[PDB]
Symmetry: C2
Subunit: 69 residues, 2 copies
């Protein structure tokens, strides 16, 4: 089943690349209708980046959650 | 740059999972407007599957080619 290839990929994509900033925590994310938005940082490091004034790691990658578009 | 995280992922996704049927050739694919469609089989095994009457591996996974949806 093709939807499961996509789901297992997202599961892996999410797991093997932690927060770009602290490198250990997993990334923040949310579901935005038909896509999964994976933010570049965990929530702790994102808030911290505002405080310290660094917007270098700000960003996200959206992933279609289904196999067919 | 976020578009590049998506591109490098697709590059990897495409490379580490060859044809589901013969297991060596890389998969067929095409660009369908804003998505990359990765078919489950290379072209040789897909045509062959019609000939032998097996539709078990028929299918594809579409991937949004950009970071933002
Ligand atoms: N945890 C995070 N790590 C990195 N960047 C983030 C994080 N949370 C938000 N951002 C960035 O801040 C902005 C807010 O995004 P978001 O709230 O998803 O947009 P929208 O409100 O349109 O859904 C975007 O640039 C997003 O990439
Ligand atoms: N190389 C291949 N491997 C596996 N399945 C395939 C392959 N080529 C086509 N198919 C399947 O046959 C059908 C034809 O798909 P496609 O021509 O992409 O649709 P469309 O013409 O709407 O763009 C779909 O079920 C597709 O998944
Ligand atoms: Cl996707
Ligand atoms: Zn972090
Ligand atoms: Zn093959």
């Amino acid at each position: 089943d093709d939807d499961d290839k996509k789901t297992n990929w997202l599961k892996r994509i999410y797991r093997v690349r932690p927060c770009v900033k602290c490198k250990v925590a997993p990334r923040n994310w949310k579901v935005k209708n038909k896509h999964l938005r994976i933010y570049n940082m965990c929530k702790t490091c994102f808030n911290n980046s505002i405080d310290i004034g660094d917007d270098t790691y700000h960003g996200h990658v959206d992933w279609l959650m289904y196999a067919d578009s």
